[PDB]
Amino acid sequence: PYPNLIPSANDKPYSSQELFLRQLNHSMRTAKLGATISKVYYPHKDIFYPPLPENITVESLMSAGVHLGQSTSLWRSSTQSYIYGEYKGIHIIDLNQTLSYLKRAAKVVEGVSESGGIILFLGTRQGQKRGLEEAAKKTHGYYVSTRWIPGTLTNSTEISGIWEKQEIDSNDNPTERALSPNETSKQVKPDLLVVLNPTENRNALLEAIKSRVPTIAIIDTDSEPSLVTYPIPGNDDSLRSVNFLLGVLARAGQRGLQNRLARNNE
Amino acid sequence: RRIVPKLATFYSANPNHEDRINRLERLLRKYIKLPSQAPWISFDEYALIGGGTKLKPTQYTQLLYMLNKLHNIDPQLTNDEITSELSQYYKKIKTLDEFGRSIA
Amino acid sequence: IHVVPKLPNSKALLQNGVPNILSSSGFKTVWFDYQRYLCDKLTLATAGQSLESYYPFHILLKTAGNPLQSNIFNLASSIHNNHLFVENILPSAKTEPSRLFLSKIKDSFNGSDWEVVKEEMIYRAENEVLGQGWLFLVENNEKKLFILTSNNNGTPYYFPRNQSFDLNSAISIDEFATLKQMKELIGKSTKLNGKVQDWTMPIICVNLWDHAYLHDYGVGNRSKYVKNVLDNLNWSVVNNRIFS
Amino acid sequence: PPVYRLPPLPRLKVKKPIIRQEANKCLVLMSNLLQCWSSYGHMSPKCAGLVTELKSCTSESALGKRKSNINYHAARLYDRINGKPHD
Amino acid sequence: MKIQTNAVNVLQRTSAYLKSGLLKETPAWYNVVASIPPSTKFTREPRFKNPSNGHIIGKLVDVTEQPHANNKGLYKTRPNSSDKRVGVKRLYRPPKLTYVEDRLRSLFYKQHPWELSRPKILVENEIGDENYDWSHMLQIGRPLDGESVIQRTMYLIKTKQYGDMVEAYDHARYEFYALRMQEETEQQVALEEAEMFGSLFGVSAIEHGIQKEQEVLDVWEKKVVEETELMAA
Amino acid sequence: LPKSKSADVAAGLHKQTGVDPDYITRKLTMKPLVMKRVSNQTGKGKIASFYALVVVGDKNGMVGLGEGKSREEMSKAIFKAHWDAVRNLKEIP
Amino acid sequence: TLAELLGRSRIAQVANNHKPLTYTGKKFHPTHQIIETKPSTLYRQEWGLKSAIPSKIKSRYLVYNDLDTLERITTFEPRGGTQWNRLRFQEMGVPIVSNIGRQNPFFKKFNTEIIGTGGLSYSLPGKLKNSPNGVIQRTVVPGRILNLAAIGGFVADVVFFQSPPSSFNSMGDFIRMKTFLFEILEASMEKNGSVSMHARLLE
Amino acid sequence: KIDQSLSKKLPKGTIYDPFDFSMGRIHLDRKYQDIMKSGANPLEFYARPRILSRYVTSTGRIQHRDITGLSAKNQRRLSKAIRRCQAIGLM
Ligand SMILES: [Mg+2]
Numbered sequence A: 001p002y003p004n005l006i007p008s009a010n011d012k013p014y015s016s017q018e019l020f021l022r023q024l025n026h027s028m029r030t031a032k033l034g035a036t037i038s039k040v041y042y043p044h045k046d047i048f049y050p051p052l053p054e055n056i057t058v059e060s061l062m063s064a065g066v067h068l069g070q071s072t073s074l075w076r077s078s079t080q081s082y083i084y085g086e087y088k089g090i091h092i093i094d095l096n097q098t099l100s101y102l103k104r105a106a107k108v109v110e111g112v113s114e115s116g117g118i119i120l121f122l123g124t125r126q127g128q129k130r131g132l133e134e135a136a137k138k139t140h141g142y143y144v145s146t147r148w149i150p151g152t153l154t155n156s157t158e159i160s161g162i163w164e165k166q167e168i169d170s171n172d173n174p175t176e177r178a179l180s181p182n183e184t185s186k187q188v189k190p191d192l193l194v195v196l197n198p199t200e201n202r203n204a205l206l207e208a209i210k211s212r213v214p215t216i217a218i219i220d221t222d223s224e225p226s227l228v229t230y231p232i233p234g235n236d237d238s239l240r241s242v243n244f245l246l247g248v249l250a251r252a253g254q255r256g257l258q259n260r261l262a263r264n265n266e
Numbered sequence B: 001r002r003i004v005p006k007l008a009t010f011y012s013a014n015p016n017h018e019d020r021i022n023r024l025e026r027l028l029r030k031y032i033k034l035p036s037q038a039p040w041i042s043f044d045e046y047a048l049i050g051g052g053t054k055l056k057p058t059q060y061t062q063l064l065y066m067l068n069k070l071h072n073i074d075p076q077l078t079n080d081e082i083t084s085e086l087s088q089y090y091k092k093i094k095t096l097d098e099f100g101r102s103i104a
Numbered sequence C: 001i002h003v004v005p006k007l008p009n010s011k012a013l014l015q016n017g018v019p020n021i022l023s024s025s026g027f028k029t030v031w032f033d034y035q036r037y038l039c040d041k042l043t044l045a046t047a048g049q050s051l052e053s054y055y056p057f058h059i060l061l062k063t064a065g066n067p068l069q070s071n072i073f074n075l076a077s078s079i080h081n082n083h084l085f086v087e088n089i090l091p092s093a094k095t096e097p098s099r100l101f102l103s104k105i106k107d108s109f110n111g112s113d114w115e116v117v118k119e120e121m122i123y124r125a126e127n128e129v130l131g132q133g134w135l136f137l138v139e140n141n142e143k144k145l146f147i148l149t150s151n152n153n154g155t156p157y158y159f160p161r162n163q164s165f166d167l168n169s170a171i172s173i174d175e176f177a178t179l180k181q182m183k184e185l186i187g188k189s190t191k192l193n194g195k196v197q198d199w200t201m202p203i204i205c206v207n208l209w210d211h212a213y214l215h216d217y218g219v220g221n222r223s224k225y226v227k228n229v230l231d232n233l234n235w236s237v238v239n240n241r242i243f244s
Numbered sequence D: 001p002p003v004y005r006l007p008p009l010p011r012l013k014v015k016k017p018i019i020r021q022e023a024n025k026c027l028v029l030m031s032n033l034l035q036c037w038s039s040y041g042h043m044s045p046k047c048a049g050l051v052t053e054l055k056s057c058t059s060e061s062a063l064g065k066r067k068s069n070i071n072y073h074a075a076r077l078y079d080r081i082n083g084k085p086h087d
Numbered sequence E: 001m002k003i004q005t006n007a008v009n010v011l012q013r014t015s016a017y018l019k020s021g022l023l024k025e026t027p028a029w030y031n032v033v034a035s036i037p038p039s040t041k042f043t044r045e046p047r048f049k050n051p052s053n054g055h056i057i058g059k060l061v062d063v064t065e066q067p068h069a070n071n072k073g074l075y076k077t078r079p080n081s082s083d084k085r086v087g088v089k090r091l092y093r094p095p096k097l098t099y100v101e102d103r104l105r106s107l108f109y110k111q112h113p114w115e116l117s118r119p120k121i122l123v124e125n126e127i128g129d130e131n132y133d134w135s136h137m138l139q140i141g142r143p144l145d146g147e148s149v150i151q152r153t154m155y156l157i158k159t160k161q162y163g164d165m166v167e168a169y170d171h172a173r174y175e176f177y178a179l180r181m182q183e184e185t186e187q188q189v190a191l192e193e194a195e196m197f198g199s200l201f202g203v204s205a206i207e208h209g210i211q212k213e214q215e216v217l218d219v220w221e222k223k224v225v226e227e228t229e230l231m232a233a
Numbered sequence F: 001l002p003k004s005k006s007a008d009v010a011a012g013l014h015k016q017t018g019v020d021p022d023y024i025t026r027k028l029t030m031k032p033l034v035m036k037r038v039s040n041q042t043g044k045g046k047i048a049s050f051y052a053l054v055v056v057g058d059k060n061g062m063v064g065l066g067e068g069k070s071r072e073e074m075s076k077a078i079f080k081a082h083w084d085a086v087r088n089l090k091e092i093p
Numbered sequence G: 001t002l003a004e005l006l007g008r009s010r011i012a013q014v015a016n017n018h019k020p021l022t023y024t025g026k027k028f029h030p031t032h033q034i035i036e037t038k039p040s041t042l043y044r045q046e047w048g049l050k051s052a053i054p055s056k057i058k059s060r061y062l063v064y065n066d067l068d069t070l071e072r073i074t075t076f077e078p079r080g081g082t083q084w085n086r087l088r089f090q091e092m093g094v095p096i097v098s099n100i101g102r103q104n105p106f107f108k109k110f111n112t113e114i115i116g117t118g119g120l121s122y123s124l125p126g127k128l129k130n131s132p133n134g135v136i137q138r139t140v141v142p143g144r145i146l147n148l149a150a151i152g153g154f155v156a157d158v159v160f161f162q163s164p165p166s167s168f169n170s171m172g173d174f175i176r177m178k179t180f181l182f183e184i185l186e187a188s189m190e191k192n193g194s195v196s197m198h199a200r201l202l203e
Numbered sequence H: 001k002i003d004q005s006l007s008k009k010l011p012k013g014t015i016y017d018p019f020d021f022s023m024g025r026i027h028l029d030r031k032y033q034d035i036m037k038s039g040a041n042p043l044e045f046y047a048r049p050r051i052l053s054r055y056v057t058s059t060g061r062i063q064h065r066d067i068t069g070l071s072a073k074n075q076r077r078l079s080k081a082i083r084r085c086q087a088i089g090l091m
C-alpha cells in the first residue's frame, strides 16, 4: 500500500503525504473513540443496509417520510382509497396499506430475480441515480437515470440495436462465446420495470403495458395507480423515502438471487 | 443458458458512456479522501470507444472532469488501479552559413 | 444518542478495577459512571442539532473555534480524553514500550532516558495544573514529542483550545508573549470560521481530574497516582498511536 | 386580494425580454458637456477636462463598450407552475 | 384518467399468447405473477371514523335523540334542511386530521417568538426506537423545545394532576423556563472558563456578523456611487 | 444471398417482439378489409398514399386488426398492415 | 395508531403559519421556525419535508410556509438569520429586564401576548463576568452608525458626550462603512416584542 | 452626501440582517408596498364629501375596485353614495 510514498528524512519533519497518512491512521484507530452513537439516521445506510420486507414497520415508513402525499389541490381522486387523511394542506398516505403493497411488490421482485429475470430500475429524478445503480448492482439487474428514450421496448431494434449482449450460466458467469448476428439482434425485454417517478415517465409505463411487462411504481397522491401492475402508495418526491422503498426492493431481489444461486449450486 | 445485456446501463440513452463514467465514479468514491496536489483523448477518439454518434458534448465534459480530478490525486498517494483506469484515456533548426549570414 | 463504548473484559474490570492504579470503585467513578454522565450531558446539549450524528472528537474539532457552545466542546473533549486515558490504562484487549518510540523520545528530550522523561512529566503535572485537568505526551508535525498539560477540558489536538495555562492566576512575560504569538497566528488564518491548521496527536493522555484518583489516593497524592499510571499502562496501544 | 388564474395556454413566454443594461459612459459625458455649454457661453474652460474625457472615450469608436434567459425558464417551468388539473 | 385494464391483466394476455403459440417460451415473471395476483379493484372506499379525533363520520343525530330544548329554547320536532340532504361525499372525501396539540404549539410560538429562531431538524431518526416518559421534560434523544412542553402538558392532562388543560400548559412552560435558564448559564460560564484558561477564539459571532455586513456595504457603496453618477448625468 | 412475404414479416416480428415465427407463418391467416388510395395536398402537389386495413387471425379465437400505409405501391402498405395486425393479436371470448 | 404518530412527528411539531416570507415592514422578532439540515442530508437534498429541495440551495438552514403548493413547489426561503441575531445578543451579554416595576414572568383563558422576552434571552440580570484582565464593567461591542446604530443584529438608540465632527462630517451618509465601538447600557423590551437597546459611542 | 432612495433607514426597535444593508433589499422594499374597509356601509357618508373624496381621482372620477381595493358590494355602495353626493350640492 502507497508504493510511491517518498518518506521524509528522520531529522526533517513529516512531509504532506506522510502527515495525511498519519491522520488517516489516527482516524481508523482512535478518532471514533469517546462514544458510540446509537439511534441516528445516516442517509447512506439506507442504500447499503436496507431492511428486509418483513422487518419494515409503519413507524420506519413514517420516519422515511413515505406518508407525505402530494397536495390537497393536486389530487387525483383515483388514488382516494390509499389516502389516510389530510393535514398541513397535504394528503397523507395510509401507511399500513403502503406496507402491504410494498410487501407484495417486494415478493414479486424476489420471484423474478429467483427465476433469473431482467429487473430494470427507472428513476429520472435528480438525486436518485446512485441508489438506483446500487440496487441494480445488488440483484444482477439494470437501471436508467438519464432519460428513457421513448420506444426502448416498443422500438427496441432501432434504439437498443448496437449494444453488446452476453451469455450467462445458471450462475452469473459470462461464458464468453461469440453471439451470432441473428442471435444478437433480438430484443431483450425486461421481466420487471420498477419506476421511482411514474408521473414523470408515463411513456415508459405505456410501453411496458404494450410490451406486456409487469411493472412496479411509487404511486403518490397525484399519480394514476391503474397504470401499473403493483403500485406502492408513497412519497415519490422526497429522495430518502424513495431510496428506502427502492433499497427494500433491491434487498428482496438480492435474497431471491442468492436463493437461485444456492439452488444452482445444489 | 440465457442471452442478456452486458452493461447494467444497457437501457439508458448512451449505455457505454454511462458504464465508463460509473467506473471512474467508483474510483473517486474509493479514493475520495486522498489529497489533490492533461493529455486526454479527444471527443472523436472517445466516441469510437464510448457512445459513438450518441456521445454528447456535456457527457464528454463530465468524463474529462472525472478523469482530471482522479489524475490530480497527489502522485505519491495514487494507486495502481486508478492509473490503469486512466491509462485508456491518454494520448529543423536554422543556422548561419559558411560566411556568417542568414538567408531568408 | 451518544452512549459509552463496551470495554474489553468489562465484567473483570467491574469486579477488580485495574490491578495497580485504580480500584473497582475508583474505576467505576472515573468510567462506568462519570463517562456515562458526560455522554448523557453531550446528548442533552446536542440532541436536535446537526452535531448529534458526529463522533466526540469530530464534534470537538467542529466546535473548537466557536466561543459560544463551549459547553459542547468541553463535554466532547472530556469524553474523548477520558476514553484515551482508559485505553492507555487497560491491561489487555506483558507489553513493553516500542524501540521506535524510545528513539523518538531520545531525539526529543536531548538524549534523555524514558524514566527521566516520566519524572519531567510528573513534575509538570504537579506544577502546571491546579484543580482539574489533563496530562498529555503529544507528537506534532515536527516528529519530536513534547509534554502538554491542559487545565480542565483542554484538547491536545487544537492549540487554541490547549487550555494550557491559567490566566485566573498571575502569568509570566514569556507566557504572555507566547499567547500573543498564538493570537496573531489565529488572526493570520483568514477563514470565515477562523480556524488554524494543527497536527498534534496525543501519545499518552493521563486524567488529572479528581474522578480518577480522589477515591483511591485521597485529595493529595495526585502526583503518586500519575506516577502509578505511567508505570502501568497499555504500551501496545501507545505504540499503535505513534507511527505515521 | 384578487388572484387572476389564466386558462391553459400553448406557451408561456414574454414577447420581448428587456435586459435593462446601464447607459453608455461616452453618451453621458457628451450630455454633461452639452449641459455645461448651455451655461457659461459657448466654450469656456470650466468644461476643459470634460471635453478631454469625452475625446478619450470616443477615440477608437463613437461608443465605448459594445441577453436575459427569461423565456427558457418560463418555458421550462410552465407545466409545473400551472394549476392545470390532472390527466 | 380512465381505469387502465392493460397494466394489471398482463398474465392473462400472455397466457392467451402461450395458448396460441405466439409465445414459444414462458417469461420469467409469469409464474411469479400467477402466484401473487394484482389488486384490479380500483374502488372509492368509504371511511366512517376520523382517525385523529375519533369522531364518527356516518351517523346522523335524530329528532328523538335530541329531546331537550335547543339554544333559544325551541324543541326540535322536525328534520332540518341539512338532515334531509344525502351526505355521501363526507363518507368518501378524506378526513381533515385535527389535534389538540396543534393549538398549543401555535399558542407557544405566539408567546415565545424567539423560540422559532432555535433551528429544528425535521429529518426523523427511528420513530419506533424512542420511549419518552413525560413525567419530566428532559428526554435524551429529544432536545428541549416547545414540543417537549406540549408533550408534558398532554401527559399532565392524561394523568389528571392538573384536570384543566391551561394549568397543565402553564406548569409545563414553567418547567421549561428553569431548564432554559440553566442552559443559558451553562454556556456563559463555559465561555468564562475558556477565557480564564487561555483559550483563543479567532472569530466571535458578533465579529463574524460585522464582517458579513462589511462585504455587503462595500458592494452597495460602489453601486451607489455609479447610481449617483447616472443620476447626475 | 437471396408466403415469402409472410415469412419475412414473421421473422421481423420475432426480432422486434420475441413472437414465434412458425406460428405466424402457419396458423395465422390474413384478410384485407379495406384497400384505399389516399392523398395529401402538399406544396409539391397532391401526394397519394396506399392505405390498407388487414385482419389477421388464428381460427381459434385469436384475432387482430392492423392498418398500414405506403407512398410506394400497395403491397408495402398491406405488409405493414399485416405486421400491425400480428403486433395487435387479441384473444376474443 | 398512525394518526397519533403523525401528531407526534416532526412536521406536526412545526406550528403552521401563512405569514409572508418576504415582509418588508418592521421586523421585531422571528416570523418563521428556522429549519436546519445536517450536511449529509443536504448532500442528498433531504430536509425532512414532503419533497426534495433544489440542489441550488447550499445553505443548511431555511424557512417555509407550505409543504407543497398548487404551483408544485414548496414555499420556502433559504435563510436562518434570526438564530444569529439571538446568538449575537447572547454574546453581548446585556440581560433584558423590564424597565417597568414588574416580576420576572418566568418565575411565579390563554394570553397570546409575548411572555416577558420571546426567548431570545433566559439570562438573569445579577451576574458579573470575570476575565484575565478583570471583571468587565462596561460591555464593549462594535457597531455601525446609520445617520440610531446597528449593533450585532439589533438597531439601538445612541448617546454621547460630544458629537464627533471628524468622523461624521467627513463621510456624512457613508457612516455605515466605518465600524465604531459601543458601550451598551441596558436592554428594555416593549409590548410589541421589540428589543429597545441603548448604546454609547466610544472614541 | 447622498439621496434618500439609495439607503434603507433601519427603524429603532427593529432587527436587521447583513442583506438588509444592500441595494437588493431596497429594491425589494420598493417592489413590495380605512373606514370603508372597516365594515360600515358607505351610504352613511353621502353628507360627508371629505371622506368620499378620498375614493375619487383629482379630477372627480370614482376609483376602480382594483385601485380602491374594496369588497364588491361595499365598492358599489361607495359609488352610489358618491353619485348621491354629486346629485346634491355638497360634492
Ligand atoms: Mg409526485
Ligand SMILES: [Mg+2]
Residues within 6 Å of the ligand: none
Ligand atoms: Mg389506430
